[model samples]
Target: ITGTSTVGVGRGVLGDQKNINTTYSTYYYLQDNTRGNGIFTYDAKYRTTLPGSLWADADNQFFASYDAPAVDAHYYAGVTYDYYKNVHNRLSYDGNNAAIRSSVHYSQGYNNAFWNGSQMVYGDGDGQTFIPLSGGIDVVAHELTHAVTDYTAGLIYQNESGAINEAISDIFGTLVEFYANKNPDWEIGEDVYTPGISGDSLRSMSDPAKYGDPDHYSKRYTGTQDNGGVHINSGIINKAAYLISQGGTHYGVSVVGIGRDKLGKIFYRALTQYLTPTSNFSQLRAAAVQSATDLYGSTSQEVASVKQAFDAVGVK
Candidate 1:
C-alpha cells in the first residue's frame, strides 16, 4: 500500500527508541520507500505463513510491547540494505534494488530465523533460549546475507559447500554489525541468544572453538546432522575470515590482519565472481586468493593475508 512517505518513532525489541520509515495512507504502514525498491515488514501473528499482514499502526508511534519485533525487523532491514548499497555498492540482496521483506512474531516460540529463499522470517524465541531475533542486527544481516548468497554463489547447502555458505552469512553478518557501528563484536547472535546468559552467543567468529565449534579444518564435523554439519563446520571458515580481518596465528600459521573492508571485498568478489554451487573448502580458499589477487594483485599484503588466513585455518 502506497502512501505519503513519513517517519515514525518506535522502540525496538531491545527497548531502544529509534525512528522508522513508514507510509501514511490511513494507518501508518511499515513500508520504507527510501531504499531500493522498498523495505516491508509484516506480522505473522504466531503463525507460519509467509509474509503475513503488513504491519499497521493506528498512530505513527510504535512503542507497544507487541510492536517491538515489527519495528526492529523493519528498521534493521533498512540498515542492512544501507550496508550493502553504501559499503558494497550493491543494491538490495540481488544487487538490483530488489524489494526486501520480513515477517516477525512467527510461530509460537520459534527459536530461529531464516531467509526461506524469498523473504526473511524471524522467530519469537521462547523467551528463555532467545528473544525476538530481530533484536540482533547481525541476525537480520545474517538472514539477508543468505539471500545474497542465493543470488550469487548459490552454494550447495551440504558438506563443505554448506559450511562455506553458513560462514559467508556469518562473515557478512559480522561485517554489517561493524558497519552499523553499534556495540559491535565478532560474535553471532549474542544480543538475542539466551537472554538469561550474559556474554554468550550462538557462535563466535573470533574464536569459534569457544562454543565447541571446530576452528581448524582438522576438527571439522563429518556427521550428517545439521545438514552435514553446515553450522558446526562453518567455524573453520569463520575463523579464517576472522583471521583475515583481525589477524591471528592458528595451527602454527600466522596471518597478518588485512582489515574488514578488504576482507569483505575479497569475499564478496569470491562469492559473486569465482565461487560455484559445489565449491568446497579448498575451492573457497582458491576463490579468496584469486579475488584478493584480482583486487590487490599477487604481491599485495591483501593477497598474502587471504592465503595465510586460509592456511591458518588449515583450509588447504
Candidate 2:
C-alpha cells in the first residue's frame, strides 16, 4: 500500500490517549514511519498464523475498543525502539535498524507474549489472568529485549545461562519502564496481570519470593522443568539488580545503592561485552564487576556496589 505518512490519535488498552504513526495508503494502516526502518503492527484476528493482515482503518482514528491492543503494541514498540537507540546508542534489536514488527490478538485467550526470534507477538489474555500482554510497557520492552539478547549475547535459553537471559530481560525491562517514567517499579507485568487484583505481579524483582521464586543462588532451581528454571532462578539476579539500584539488606548481607542509571550502564556493558551463550551465575558476577569497573574505576563506589549487590544475593 503506497500512502502518505500520517499521525493517528487513539486510546490504548489502558485507556491512555497517544498519537501513533500510520500510513495513508488506499486504506489507513498501522505502520509507523517515525522510527528506524518503520514499525509495522498487524492483527492476528484470534488466529494462530504468522503476521496477519496489516491493521487497516478508514478514518485513521482508532477508538473502537477492539483496537486497543494494536494501539498499545504499536506505541510500546516505538518506545522500546527509542529506549535502545536514545539510551544505549543501539540502532535496533539487531543493532542495524532492523524493521520492527508485532502481531496482536494472536489466538483466542492467549495469555503470553514473546519475541519469536524475529518479531514480537502478543496475545489478548482471557481477562482473568491478563488483559493484553502488550498493554504493559515493561512487558513489551521485556519481549523486545529478548531480541536484543539474541543478537548480542545470544544467551542460550536453558539452565543458568537461560536464567541470565531471563534476568537480563527483566533488568532492562524494568529500566525501560523507569526510562519511560510510567508508574515505574521493580515489579514485572504488574499493570497487565490480574486486573482485578492490586499489588500482584507476574514476578517481583525486589522480592522474588513474593511469587515463590528464588532470590538467592543457594535456592536456585536445578530441576529440568522450565528450562532449568530460567524464569524462576532469574529472581536471584533480579534481586541483585534491585539492590544495586536501591540498596537493601538480604539474609544479613548489606549492599550500597548505586542508583538505576549506573545499574543500567553496568548491566548493559556486561550484557553487550562479557556475557556469552554459556555464561553462568558465577560468570555473571565477574562480568558485572568488570563492567562496573570499566564504567567507573576499579576502586570506584559503583564497582564496589556491584560486588556488594551480588554478594547480598549470594551470587558468589
Candidate 3:
C-alpha cells in the first residue's frame, strides 16, 4: 500500500514533523497508497456483525506497510484509549467519543514525528541516527497524550507551562507504554533511535541526567534543539512524577513512602479536573497533593508522599 503525493506550493503537512501545531493544521495532498487514504476507518457493521473478523483486511494491510512498528502504533493507541477510559473514565480524546486518526510514512528522510493537534504522523527516518518514531509505543502514546493535554488542562507552551505540557504527555505516554505490557523498562523512545548514534533519544525518563553531550540539565540550548527541549528538560518533571508514582529517591533526596497508583490518579485528577492554563509547578504540586487528600483522606500517607515527591523536585 503505497500512497505518494508531491508537496509544493500551498500544500499542508499534518503531524509529519516536530512543529506540532503548524504541522497538523497545514493541509497536504494524500500520497499514493494502495489503500487509497492512509487512514483506518473503523467499520461499525463489521465490528458488530462479524465481531470475530472486524477490519481484518484493513488492519492486515496497514501492518504490512511498516512490518512491525506500524502495527505497534495501532496497538499502543488501543491501549492508551483503554487506559484513559478505564482508569479515569475518559471516553476518548475529548471525552465525547472523538475518532482517533494516525498516518505513517509521512515524509521522505524525515527524522521526526508528532501529533499535529489532529492526527498522529510518522516518518521513515534518515536510516541512520533515527529509524522510525513509530518504533516506540511511548512515542505514539506521547503524541496522543498531547491531544489529551490540549483537551484538558490546555497547558500553556512556555517556560514551566511548556515543560508541564510536555511532562504531562510523557507521564501518560510512559503509562500507556507500561499499560500495553511492552517494554517495562520505563524509558522513552528506546526503540526509535538507532543504537549506533551515541547519546540519542527523543527524551529519557528514567534518567534525564544522562542525555545529550556533557549530560546535564544546565547545558546551554543551541536553539535548534527539540522544541526548546520540551522533550529533554521534561525529564525534570518526568523524573519527579516517576519518583512519586514508583516511590524512589531523586536528586539525592529520599521519598520511600509513596504509592504509584495513588500518585498517578492524583495527577490525573488534578490534570483533568483542577488544572487551568495559568497553573504553575507549585500550583500543580499543591493541586495534586490536594487531589490525593480528597480521594483518600487528610491523614493518608499517600498525600504526604505525593507532597514529599513534589518537594523533592523543588516544587514545594
Candidate 4:
C-alpha cells in the first residue's frame, strides 16, 4: 500500500495484544513500510489461491479472531527481519531488505505453514493439531529462514542437503525464538502445535528422538517419503546443533557446550560462506568445522566443540 505509514494495535493469534506496522491508504492496511520495501499480510479467505487481498480494516484496531492470524504473521515477520538485521547485520532474508509478504487463513482446517518460494503462507489449524501457525514465532521464523537458506546456501531440497536445509531452518527458528525472549525453548512450533495437548511440540531440538526423529546419523531414514526424509533426518543435525550449543554425550562421544551465540555464529558463517548446494553430511561437518575455525580459531574451544558435536551425532 503506497500511503502514509502508521502503527496499528491488534491482538494476535494467541489473543496477545501487539502493535503492528500498517499503512493508512483508505482503510488501515496490513502493509508495513518500516522494513525493506514493505511487509504485507494478506487474507486468504480459506481458499488458498495465493497472496489474497491485503488485509484491510475499517478500524485500525484488530481484535477479532479472524484478524489474529494476520496480526501475528505481520508482527512476527517484522521480528524475524529484525533478528537478521540487528544480530547478523543482514538486511533481510535476501540481504537486500526485500519485501516480506505473508498470507494467513489459507484454507479451512489447514494445519501447516510454509515459504512458497516467494512469500510466506500460514494456515489456521483445525483447532486441535494447531491453532494458527503464525502464532508460533518459531514456526514463522522457521519458514522465513527457508527463504534465507534459499538465498544463501541454496541447499537442494533433497537427500542430505535437504536434511541440512531443514535443520538450518530449525536451528535459526530456535535462535529467533530465543532472540524474541518469550517462552523460548529448544522445541520447534510448541506454541501452535497440538493446542489440546499439553507440553507437546512439532519437534524437539534437545532430544529429536522424543518425537521419533533420529538423533544420530546412523538412525537416519533412507525412504523416499517427505522428500527423502528431509524433515525426519533433520533431527540428526538438530541434535548436533543442540549439542554444540548445550553439550551432551551421545553414544560414546562427549561434547563440551559452546553456547548459543557461538553456535549461531558458526552455522551462519557456514551457511553463508562454506556450505554449498548438494553438500552432504560430511561436507556440512567440514563447513561447520571451518566456520568455527574462522570465528574462534583452529585451537579454540568453539572449533573443538563443533567437531565433538558432529562426532557425537555420528556425522563423521
Candidate 5:
C-alpha cells in the first residue's frame, strides 16, 4: 500500500523494546520503505495460509503481546536487507533491489521457519523448543539468505549441494549477526531457540558437533531424511567457515584464521561466481580457495587459510 514512511515503537518476542519502520496512511502498517524497494511483513494468524495479511495497528505503537513476532519479523528483515546491501554491495536477495516479504505466526506449534521460494515464513513455535523464530535476527537472516542462495548459486536442494546451501545460510546469518553488533556469537538461533535452556542453540557454527551436528566430512550423514541430511551435514562446511574466520585445530589439522570479513568475501564470491547447482563438498573447497585467491593473491595467507580450513574439515 502507498503510504508515508514512519517509525513505530514496538516490543519483540523476546520482550526487547525497539523502534521499527512502518508506513502510515490511516493506520500503521509493518512496511519499511528505507531498505531496497520495501520490506513488508504480514500476519499468518497461526494458519497455513501464506502472506496472510499486512499487519496493521491503529496507532504506531506495537506493545501488545500478539504484536511481538510481527514487530521483530519486520525489524529483522530490514536489518538483514541492510547487511546484504551495506556489507555485500548486493541489493536484495536477487541483487536487484527486490522487495522483501515475510509472514509470522504461521501455525500453532509450527516450530520451524523456511523460505518457500517466494517469501519467508515463520512459525509460532510450541513454546517449548522455541518461542517465535522471527525474534532471532540470525534466524531471520538465515531464512532470507535462502532466497539469496536461490537467486545466486541455485544449488540443488538435496545431497551435498543442499548441505552447501544450508551452510551458506548459516555462514552469512552469523555474519549478519556480527554486522549488527548485537551480542553476536557463532551460534545460530541462540536468541530464540529453547527459551528454557541457556547456552544452547539450534546449531553451533563454532562447534557444530556440540549439537550432534557433524563438524568433520568423515562423519557426513548419508540418510534420506532431511533432504539427504542437508541440515546435519551442513556442520562440516559450517566448521570450515568457522575455522577460516577463527583459527582452530580439528582432527589433527590446523587452520590459520583470516578473520570474518575475508571469510565472508571469499564465500560470497564463491557462491555468486563459482558454485553451480550440483557442486559438492570437494567443489566447494575449490571454489572457496579460488574465491580467496581472487580477492587476495594465490600466495596470500587468505588463500592458504582457505585451503587449510577446508583441509581441517576434511572437505578434500
Candidate 6:
C-alpha cells in the first residue's frame, strides 16, 4: 500500500523518469488528500485483478525491455502473494484488494532494487556483476515486504528502527523463498548476483558471522553506507529467526523451539499487529515473545526460543 501522500507528482520523481517527464500536467494539487488516491489515466492497463498494482515499461532500453524481467517479477509476486494467502490466510499486500504493480528495467544498469511507496521496481544489473533483480524470489519478496511494512508497523527508517524495517523484510523474504520451496538454504540474493565474485549471498539469515563479521550489533555495522547497512546488520535479527525456526537452542540456553511455519507466524503477528515505529531492539524482542505466548500458549516452547534467540544475539 502507498503512503498517504499525493501520488502523481512526487511519485514520478521516486523512480527515474526517463520515458515519462518529471514535470507533467499529470500532477494534481490538493489538501487533506493523499497521493495514494490520485488518478493516473495515462495507462489503465497497470490495473490488475490482485489487491496491488502491476505495470511494466516495455520500451525501456534496459534489458531490451523484452518483458522477461516483468514476467519473472509477476511470477515471483504471485508466488509470495499466494504463500501469504494459503499459509497465513491473508489476501494481497494490504489484506484487502490493494493494487500491486511492477516496473521492469527501471533504470539502466541499476544494480539495486527497491520498493517505492506504490509499486515494486526491478533493475537489470550490470552484466558484468549483477543480473536482473527479478530472478531472485527473495528480492521480489523483499521489495514487497516494504509495502507490507508501510501498511503494518510503518517503522521509521533510521537507527534501530531502520534495522527493524530491514529485518522484517529479510524475514518475510526468506519465509516466502522457503514457502515456495525454491531453495532450502534460506540465503538472500544468491540468484541475482554473479557467483564468481561472491559465493556467499548478499546476506545470510542463519549465520551473520560467516562473513567473518561480528555476531552482535556494532557501531561499525551502522550508518548510511548500504542504506544504514540495515540490509547487512539485519543479519542479527534474521539469524535469531533462523535459530528459532530450525528448532535449535539459542546461546547456551536449552529452550525448546517450534516449527518454522509457526515461528514465522509469530514474527509476522508481532510485526504487523504489535510493533510501532519507535520500537527498539529490546521492545521488538518483548513484542515477539508476547506474540508467541499469546498465539501458542504461555508455556509454549516457541515463546522460550523466541526469547532465547533474541538474547543469544545480545539484544538485551
lDDT for residue 108 in candidate 1, whole number 0-100: 96
Model 2 vs truth, CA RMSD? 0.9
lDDT of 3 by residue, 26-77 (tens): 2322221212122231222211221111122321123233333334444456
Candidate 5 structure lDDT:
0.94
User: Which residue runs does candidate 4 get wrong by more than 4 Å?
Assistant: none
Model 1 residue 252 distance off true place after TM-score fit, in angstroms: 1.4
Residues 1-316, model 4: lDDT tens digits? 6789999999998889999999997899999998988899999999979999999998899999889999999999999999989889988899999999999999999999999999999999999999999999999999999999999999999999999999999999999999999999999999999878999999999999999999988899999999999999999999999999999888889999989998899999999999998999999999999999988889999999999999988888
Question: Would you list the clashing residue pairs of candidate 5?
Answer: none
Residue 129's lDDT in candidate 5? 96
Candidate 1 or 3, higher lDDT?
A: 1
TM-score of 6: 0.76
lDDT on C-alpha atoms for all candidate structures: 0.94, 0.93, 0.61, 0.94, 0.94, 0.66
TM-score to native of every candidate shown: 0.99, 0.98, 0.74, 0.99, 0.99, 0.76
- The sequence of per-residue lDDT tens digits that candidate 2 reaches over residues 104-214 is 999999999998888899999999999999999999999999999999898999999999999999999999999999899999999999989988999999999999999
Q: What is the lDDT of residue 140 in candidate 4?
A: 95
Error of 4 at 65 (Å): 0.4
For candidate 6, give the lDDT of residue 123: 71
Query: Residues 237-276, candidate 5, lDDT per residue (tens digit)?
Result: 9999999999998888888998999999999999999999
Global lDDT of model 6: 0.66
Clashes of 2: 0
